[PDB]
Coordinates of N, CA, C and O and ligand atoms in Angstrom, one line a residue:
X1 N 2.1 -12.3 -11.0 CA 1.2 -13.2 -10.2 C -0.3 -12.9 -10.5 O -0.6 -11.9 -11.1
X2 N -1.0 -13.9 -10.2 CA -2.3 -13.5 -10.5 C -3.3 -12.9 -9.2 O -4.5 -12.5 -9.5
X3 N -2.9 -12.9 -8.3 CA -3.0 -11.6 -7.4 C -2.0 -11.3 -6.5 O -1.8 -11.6 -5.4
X4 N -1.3 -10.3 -7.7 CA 0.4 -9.5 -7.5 C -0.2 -8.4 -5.8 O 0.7 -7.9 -5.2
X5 N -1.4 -8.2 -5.5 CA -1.7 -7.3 -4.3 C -1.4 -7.9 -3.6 O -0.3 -7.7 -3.2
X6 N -2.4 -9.4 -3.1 CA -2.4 -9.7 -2.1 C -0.9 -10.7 -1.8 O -0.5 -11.2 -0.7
X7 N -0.4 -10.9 -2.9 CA 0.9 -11.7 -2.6 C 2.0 -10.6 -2.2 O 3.0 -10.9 -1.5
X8 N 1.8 -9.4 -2.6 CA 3.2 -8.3 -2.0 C 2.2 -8.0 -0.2 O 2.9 -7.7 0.8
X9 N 1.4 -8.1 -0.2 CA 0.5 -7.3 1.0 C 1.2 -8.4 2.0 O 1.6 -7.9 3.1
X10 N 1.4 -9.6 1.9 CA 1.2 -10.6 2.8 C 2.9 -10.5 3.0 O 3.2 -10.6 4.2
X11 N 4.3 -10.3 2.2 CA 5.5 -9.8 1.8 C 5.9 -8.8 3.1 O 6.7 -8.7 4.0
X12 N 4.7 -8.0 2.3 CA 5.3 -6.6 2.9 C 5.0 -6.6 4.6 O 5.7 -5.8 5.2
X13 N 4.0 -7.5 5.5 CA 3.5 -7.3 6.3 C 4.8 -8.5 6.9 O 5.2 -8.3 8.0
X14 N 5.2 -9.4 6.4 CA 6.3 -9.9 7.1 C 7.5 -9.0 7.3 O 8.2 -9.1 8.2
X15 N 7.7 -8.1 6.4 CA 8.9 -7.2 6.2 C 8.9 -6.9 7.2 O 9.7 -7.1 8.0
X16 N 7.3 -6.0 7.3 CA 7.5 -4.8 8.5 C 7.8 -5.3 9.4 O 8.9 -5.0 9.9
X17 N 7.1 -6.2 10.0 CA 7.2 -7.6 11.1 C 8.8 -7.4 11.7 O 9.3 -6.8 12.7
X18 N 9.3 -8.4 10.5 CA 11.0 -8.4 10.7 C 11.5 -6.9 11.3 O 11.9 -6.7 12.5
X19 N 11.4 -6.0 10.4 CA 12.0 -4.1 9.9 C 11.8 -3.8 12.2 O 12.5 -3.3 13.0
X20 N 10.4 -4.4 12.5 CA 10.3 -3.5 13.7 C 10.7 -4.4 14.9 O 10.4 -4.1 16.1
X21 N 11.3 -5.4 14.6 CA 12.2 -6.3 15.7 C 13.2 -5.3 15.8 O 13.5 -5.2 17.0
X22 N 13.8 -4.6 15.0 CA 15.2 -3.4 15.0 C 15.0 -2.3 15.1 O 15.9 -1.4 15.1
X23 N 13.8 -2.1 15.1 CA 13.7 -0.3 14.4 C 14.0 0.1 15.8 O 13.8 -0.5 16.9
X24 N 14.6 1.4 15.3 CA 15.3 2.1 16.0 C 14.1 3.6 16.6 O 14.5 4.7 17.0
X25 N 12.7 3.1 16.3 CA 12.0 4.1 16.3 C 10.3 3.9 16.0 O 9.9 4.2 14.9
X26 N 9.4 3.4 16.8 CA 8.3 3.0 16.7 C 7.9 4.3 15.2 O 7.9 5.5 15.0
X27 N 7.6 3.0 14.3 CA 6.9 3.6 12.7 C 5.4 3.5 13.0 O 4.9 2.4 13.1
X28 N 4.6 4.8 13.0 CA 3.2 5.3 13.2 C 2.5 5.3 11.8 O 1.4 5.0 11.6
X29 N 3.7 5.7 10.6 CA 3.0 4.9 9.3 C 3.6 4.5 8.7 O 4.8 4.9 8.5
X30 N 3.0 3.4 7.9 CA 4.1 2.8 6.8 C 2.6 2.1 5.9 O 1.4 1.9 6.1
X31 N 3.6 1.9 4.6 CA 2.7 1.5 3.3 C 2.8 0.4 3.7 O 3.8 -0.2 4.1
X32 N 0.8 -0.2 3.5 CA 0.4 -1.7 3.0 C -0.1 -1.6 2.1 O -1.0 -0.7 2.1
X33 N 0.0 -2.4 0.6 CA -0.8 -2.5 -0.3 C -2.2 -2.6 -0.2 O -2.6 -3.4 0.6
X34 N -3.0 -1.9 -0.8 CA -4.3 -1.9 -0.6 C -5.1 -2.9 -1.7 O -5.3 -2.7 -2.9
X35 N -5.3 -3.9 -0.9 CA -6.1 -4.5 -1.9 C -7.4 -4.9 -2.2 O -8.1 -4.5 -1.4
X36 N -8.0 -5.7 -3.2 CA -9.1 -5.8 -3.4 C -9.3 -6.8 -3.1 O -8.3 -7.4 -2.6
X37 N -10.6 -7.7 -3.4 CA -10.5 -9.1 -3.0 C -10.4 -9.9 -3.7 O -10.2 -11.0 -3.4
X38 N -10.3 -9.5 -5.2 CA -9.9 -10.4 -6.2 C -8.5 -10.6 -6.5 O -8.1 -11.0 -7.6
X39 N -7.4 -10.0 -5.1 CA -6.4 -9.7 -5.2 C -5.4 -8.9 -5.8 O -4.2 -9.1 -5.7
X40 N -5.9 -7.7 -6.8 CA -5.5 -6.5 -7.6 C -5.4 -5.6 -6.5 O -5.7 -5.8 -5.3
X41 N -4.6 -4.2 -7.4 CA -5.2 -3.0 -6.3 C -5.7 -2.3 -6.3 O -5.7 -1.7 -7.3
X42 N -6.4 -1.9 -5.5 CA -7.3 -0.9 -5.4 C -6.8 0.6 -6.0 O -5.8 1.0 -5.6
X43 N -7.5 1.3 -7.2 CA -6.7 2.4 -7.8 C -6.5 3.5 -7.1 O -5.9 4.4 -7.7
X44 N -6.9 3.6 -5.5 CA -6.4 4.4 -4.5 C -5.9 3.6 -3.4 O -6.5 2.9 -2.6
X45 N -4.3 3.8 -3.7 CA -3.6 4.0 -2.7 C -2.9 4.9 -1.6 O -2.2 5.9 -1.8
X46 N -3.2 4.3 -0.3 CA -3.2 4.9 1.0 C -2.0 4.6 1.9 O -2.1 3.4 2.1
X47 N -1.1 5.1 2.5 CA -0.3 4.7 3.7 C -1.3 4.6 4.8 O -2.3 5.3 5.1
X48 N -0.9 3.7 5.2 CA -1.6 3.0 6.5 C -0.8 4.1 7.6 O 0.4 4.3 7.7
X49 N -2.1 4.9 8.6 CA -1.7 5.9 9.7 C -2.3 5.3 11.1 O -3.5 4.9 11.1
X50 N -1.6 5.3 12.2 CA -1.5 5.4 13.1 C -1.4 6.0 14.9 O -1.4 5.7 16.0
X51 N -1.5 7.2 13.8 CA -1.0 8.3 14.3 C -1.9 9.8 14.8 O -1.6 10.8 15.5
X52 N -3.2 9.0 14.1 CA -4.0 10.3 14.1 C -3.7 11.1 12.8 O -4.7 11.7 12.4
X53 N -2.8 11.2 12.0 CA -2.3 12.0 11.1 C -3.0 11.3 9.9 O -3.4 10.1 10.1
X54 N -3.3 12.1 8.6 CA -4.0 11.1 7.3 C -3.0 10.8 6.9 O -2.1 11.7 6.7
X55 N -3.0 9.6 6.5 CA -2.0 8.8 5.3 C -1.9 9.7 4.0 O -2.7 10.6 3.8
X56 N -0.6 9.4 3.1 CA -1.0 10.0 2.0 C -1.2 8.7 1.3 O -0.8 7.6 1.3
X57 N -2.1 9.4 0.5 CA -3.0 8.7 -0.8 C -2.0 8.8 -2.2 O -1.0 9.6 -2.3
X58 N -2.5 7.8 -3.1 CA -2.0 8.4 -4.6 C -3.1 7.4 -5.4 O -4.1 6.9 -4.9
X59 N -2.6 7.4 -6.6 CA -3.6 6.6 -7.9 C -2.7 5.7 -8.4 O -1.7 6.2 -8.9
X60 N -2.9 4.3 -8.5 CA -2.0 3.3 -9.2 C -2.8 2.7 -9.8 O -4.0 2.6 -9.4
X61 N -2.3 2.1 -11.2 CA -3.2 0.9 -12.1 C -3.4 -0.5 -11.4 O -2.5 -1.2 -10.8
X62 N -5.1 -0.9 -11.7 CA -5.0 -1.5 -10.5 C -4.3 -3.2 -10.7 O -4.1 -3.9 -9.7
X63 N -3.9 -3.7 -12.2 CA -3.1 -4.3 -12.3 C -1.5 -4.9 -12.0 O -1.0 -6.0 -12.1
X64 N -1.0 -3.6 -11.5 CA 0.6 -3.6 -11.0 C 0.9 -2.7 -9.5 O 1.9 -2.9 -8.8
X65 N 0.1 -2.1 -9.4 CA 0.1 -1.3 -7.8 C 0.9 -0.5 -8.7 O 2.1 -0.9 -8.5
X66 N 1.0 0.5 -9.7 CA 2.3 1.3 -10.2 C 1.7 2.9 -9.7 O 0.5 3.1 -10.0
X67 N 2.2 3.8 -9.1 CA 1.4 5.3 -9.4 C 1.4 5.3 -10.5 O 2.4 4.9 -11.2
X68 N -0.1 5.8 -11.2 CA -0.1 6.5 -12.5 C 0.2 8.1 -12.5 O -0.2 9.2 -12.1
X69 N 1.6 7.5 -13.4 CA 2.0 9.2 -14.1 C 1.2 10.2 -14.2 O 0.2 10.2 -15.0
X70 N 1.6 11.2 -13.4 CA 0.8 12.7 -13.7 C -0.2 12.6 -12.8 O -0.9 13.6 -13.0
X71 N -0.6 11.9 -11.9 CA -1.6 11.5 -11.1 C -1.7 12.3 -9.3 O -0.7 11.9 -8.7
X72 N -2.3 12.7 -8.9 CA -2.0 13.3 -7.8 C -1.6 12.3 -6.5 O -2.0 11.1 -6.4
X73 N -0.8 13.3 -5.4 CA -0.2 12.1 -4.0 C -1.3 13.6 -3.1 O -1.5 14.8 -3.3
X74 N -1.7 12.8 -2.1 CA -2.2 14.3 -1.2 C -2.4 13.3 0.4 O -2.2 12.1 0.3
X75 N -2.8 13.7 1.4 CA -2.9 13.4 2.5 C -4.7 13.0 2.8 O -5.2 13.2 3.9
X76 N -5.2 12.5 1.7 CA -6.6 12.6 1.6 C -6.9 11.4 0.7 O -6.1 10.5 0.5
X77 N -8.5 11.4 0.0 CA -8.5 11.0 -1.3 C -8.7 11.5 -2.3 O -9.7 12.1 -2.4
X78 N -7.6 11.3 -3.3 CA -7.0 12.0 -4.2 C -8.0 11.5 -5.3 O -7.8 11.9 -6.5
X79 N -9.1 10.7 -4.9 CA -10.3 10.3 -6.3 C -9.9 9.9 -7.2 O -10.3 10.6 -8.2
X80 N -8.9 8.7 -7.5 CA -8.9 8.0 -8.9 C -9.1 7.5 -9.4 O -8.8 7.4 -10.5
Ligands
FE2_101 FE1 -11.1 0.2 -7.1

């Protein structure tokens, strides 16, 4: 797609939508694609928190939302 972010972002936000009609357990975090406005991703990605707790972070190319290999995950920003 030609903005592959914001078309899974909008995906994923119906998922969750649907996922917490059933959940068996109020989810305090879960992954939204983080995107830009030109619809790519942002090369730090974050779990969306809730909770007071930090999300963990990682580094994806911002072409495909992919983690880049070898790249750090941490509860912070991981600066990529
Ligand atoms: Fe960026």
């Amino acid at each position: 797609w030609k903005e592959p972010c914001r078309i899974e972002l909008y995906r994923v936000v119906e998922s969750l939508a649907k996922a917490q009609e059933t959940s068996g357990e109020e989810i305090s975090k879960f992954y939204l694609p983080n995107c830009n406005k030109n619809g790519f991703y942002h090369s730090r990605q974050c779990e969306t928190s809730m909770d007071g707790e930090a999300g963990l972070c990682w580094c994806v190319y911002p072409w495909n939302g992919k983690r880049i290999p070898g790249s750090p995950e941490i509860r912070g920003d991981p600066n990529c």
